[PDB]
Every structure is written in structure tokens, then in C-alpha cells.
Design a protein around this nucleic acid. Structure first.
Ligand SMILES: [Mg+2]
Ligand SMILES: [Mg+2]
Ligand code: NA
Length: 327
DNA sequence: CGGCATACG
DNA sequence: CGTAT
DNA sequence: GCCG
């Protein structure tokens, strides 16, 4: 009943196995901190299966036949069901490695490889990194300076304000250009760690060179605390607050209208959903999918899409609205 | 055992 | 290397 | 870690 790919089943934002999925995603995260991408994927997939179930898992037998549940993930669920706690998961939670790798990788500009190297050098805290800025990039200096604000969840109320100011700058950079909210908020999330916008123009070609014009105007308005021709911009915005302001991460992306459906789909996520979707496309349909298009390698042609619905149809998948892509 | 998504800055 | 879903 |  439960299909093997996450793109084949609706996954709502809230579900009936929150505790179980959160435990497996701890192990997925820890696997990533050790470079085990395969293990991370299995744990992520197993967690997502539980998100797609219609009711709580209460007995171990209810895992039989579910894809991506083998000896390891089943044993985690078993201990949680019997004792409300999984020893392996708790061991990871309190490990010095896990805590520090999580703290470091959540810095903007710091990846697993950088965090791992710093950990091997004996570094453990944010103040450790501040004491030696000689080893920090300009991006990492920005992420570290703003780390506190960036750890504060972005609210849906904040998003509307940002979209307004982005549209204002986009409108002056290219009259007629549109701004579309993507990312987790388009999937219905009420909070997020950043805001994701997709920019296009209904006249193919007019979007060329647009993002530098948008960025220059945003900076001149004093709204850019940090930014790097280009089509993706990873910014830190100055977001007004009552009597003050806070730093917020904002991603801006431009696509020509011909590619807009593919870019909307990819940037709406979830991350797991897109990986599963591209995996499904290649392995089950022999088609190559990315945020630019869908390629048939046999005929050497690109599928034209006018909508996300078109893309699901060309992949033989039932359509899923953004709110059901929370894999 | 091979594979595990796929881009851009 | 970082970033993004 | 799990699937095919
Ligand atoms: Mg986001
Ligand atoms: Mg983002
Ligand atoms: Na990071």
C-alpha cells in the first residue's frame, strides 16, 4: 500500500507519528555529520514514511511491509514504543560530537566538512570561532555575527512584509516581473529559518540580468546586511521589528518563464521530496529532472511545462499540492 | 553488490 | 568549499 | 540503512 518513493504519497505538514519521525531524523542528521549519505537517506526515508501514515504506530507489527524499515529503524521504533526512549538516539543527542557539529553546521557559511575540521582542531563553541577570525571567510563572519537572529524562527507575519519590499525592488528593476513565495512557507509552514522567493517575467528573455538589478536596489534601500551575473542570491535582510529590527535569511531566485514550473517545483520542496522525485524520474521513468527542466536522454528533448500539474503528469504521478509535499 | 538529486555562487 | 529545495 |  505504502509506495517506496515519497513523491508517490501525500505527506502533510502535521501527522500522527511526530515523536517517532523526530527520533529517526536525529539518526539521519548524525549520519550526515559522519559523511554517511546512504544511512542519512534511509533514516530520512523511514521518518517520512511515518509522516505519511494515517494514524499513530502503536505496535511493532504495524511496520511490517512498510518500505525503508529494516532491522535498525524498526529497533529504534520498538524501543520508543516500549520505553518512550531510544538509547542510541539519546546517546547521540548528548554526544559532544553531535552537539558541536550541529552548532557549527547551522552557521551560515559552515558545512559539514568545515565543522568537522574545526571539531578535529579542538574547537567547540561559537566564542572559540570568534577568537580566531583569521580562519573565517567573509560569509562565515556574517553568519557568525548574525547567528543569534538567524536562530530565531521566521514568522508568517514577517514573510508578507519581506515580500512587499522585494516586490517593490523587483518592480523598479523590471516592470512586470513577479515574485512568488516558495520554500517551506508555500508548503503551509507557519515558521521557517529563511524566506524563499522565485522571480520571473511573463516575456521570455526579459528576466536576463535581473537579479543584480534587484540586489543593487535592495542594498541602496539599506535592507541588505549581507550578500555575495547570477540567478541565485543568498542574502541576510534587515527586517523591521517593533522599535528595532532583526536579521533574516532570504533567498532570491530568477528563472525564465519557460522554466518557472520546474523552478517553482524544486524550490517548494521539501528537500527529501525533490530528491525522491528526481530519483523516481531517473530510475523509474528514465527522465532527468532538475529545477530547469525535464530531459529525455533517448530523444534528447526537453519537456515543455506550463505548470506543476504538467510535470506530475509527464512523470506519471498523481498531483500533490505543496501542502502534501512535506516529506 | 551499486546506488543513493541536482543544481548554482 | 559554500549555498539551495 | 535499506531496496531492487
Ligand atoms: Mg526555506
Ligand atoms: Mg532558502
Ligand atoms: Na551552514
Amino acid at each position: 500500500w505504502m509506495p517506496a518513493y515519497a513523491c508517490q504519497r501525500p505527506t502533510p505538514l502535521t501527522h500522527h507519528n511526530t515523536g517517532l519521525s523526530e527520533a529517526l531524523e536525529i539518526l539521519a542528521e548524525a549520519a550526515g555529520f559522519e559523511g554517511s549519505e546512504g544511512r542519512l537517506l534511509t533514516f530520512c526515508r523511514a521518518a517520512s514514511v511515518l509522516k505519511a501514515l494515517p494514524s499513530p504506530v502503536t505496535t511493532l507489527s504495524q511496520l511490517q511491509g512498510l518500505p525503508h524499515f529494516g532491522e535498525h529503524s524498526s529497533r529504534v521504533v520498538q524501543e520508543l514504543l516500549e520505553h518512550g526512549v531510544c538509547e542510541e538516539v539519546e546517546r547521540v543527542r548528548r554526544s559532544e560530537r553531535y552537539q558541536t557539529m550541529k552548532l557549527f553546521t547551522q552557521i551560515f557559511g559552515v558545512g559539514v566538512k568545515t565543522a568537522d575540521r574545526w571539531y578535529r582542531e579542538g574547537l567547540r563553541t561559537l566564542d572559540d570561532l570568534r577568537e580566531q577570525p583569521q580562519k573565517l571567510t567573509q560569509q562565515q563572519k556574517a553568519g557568525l555575527q548574525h547567528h543569534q537572529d538567524l536562530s530565531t524562527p521566521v514568522l508568517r507575519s514577517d514573510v508578507d512584509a519581506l515580500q512587499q519590499v522585494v516586490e517593490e525592488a523587483v518592480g523598479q528593476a523590471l516592470p512586470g516581473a513577479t515574485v512568488t513565495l516558495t520554500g517551506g512557507f508555500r508548503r503551509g509552514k507557519l515558521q521557517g529559518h529563511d524566506v524563499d522567493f522565485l522571480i520571473t517575467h511573463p516575456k521570455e528573455g526579459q528576466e536576463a540580468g535581473l537579479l543584480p538589478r534587484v540586489m543593487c536596489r535592495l542594498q541602496d534601500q539599506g535592507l541588505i546586511l549581507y550578500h555575495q551575473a547570477f540567478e541565485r542570491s543568498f542574502c541576510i535582510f534587515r527586517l523591521p521589528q517593533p522599535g528595532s529590527w532583526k536579521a533574516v535569511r532570504v533567498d532570491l531566485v530568477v528563472a525564465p518563464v519557460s522554466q518557472f514550473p520546474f523552478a517553482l517545483l524544486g524550490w517548494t520542496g521539501s528537500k527529501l521530496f525533490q530528491r525522491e522525485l528526481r530519483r523516481f524520474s531517473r530510475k523509474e521513468k528514465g527522465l532527468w529532472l532538475n529545477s530547469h527542466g525535464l530531459f529525455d536522454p533517448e530523444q534528447k528533448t526537453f519537456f515543455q511545462a506550463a505548470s506543476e500539474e504538467d510535470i506530475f503528469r509527464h512523470l506519471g504521478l498523481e498531483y500533490l499540492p505543496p501542502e502534501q509535499r512535506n516529506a
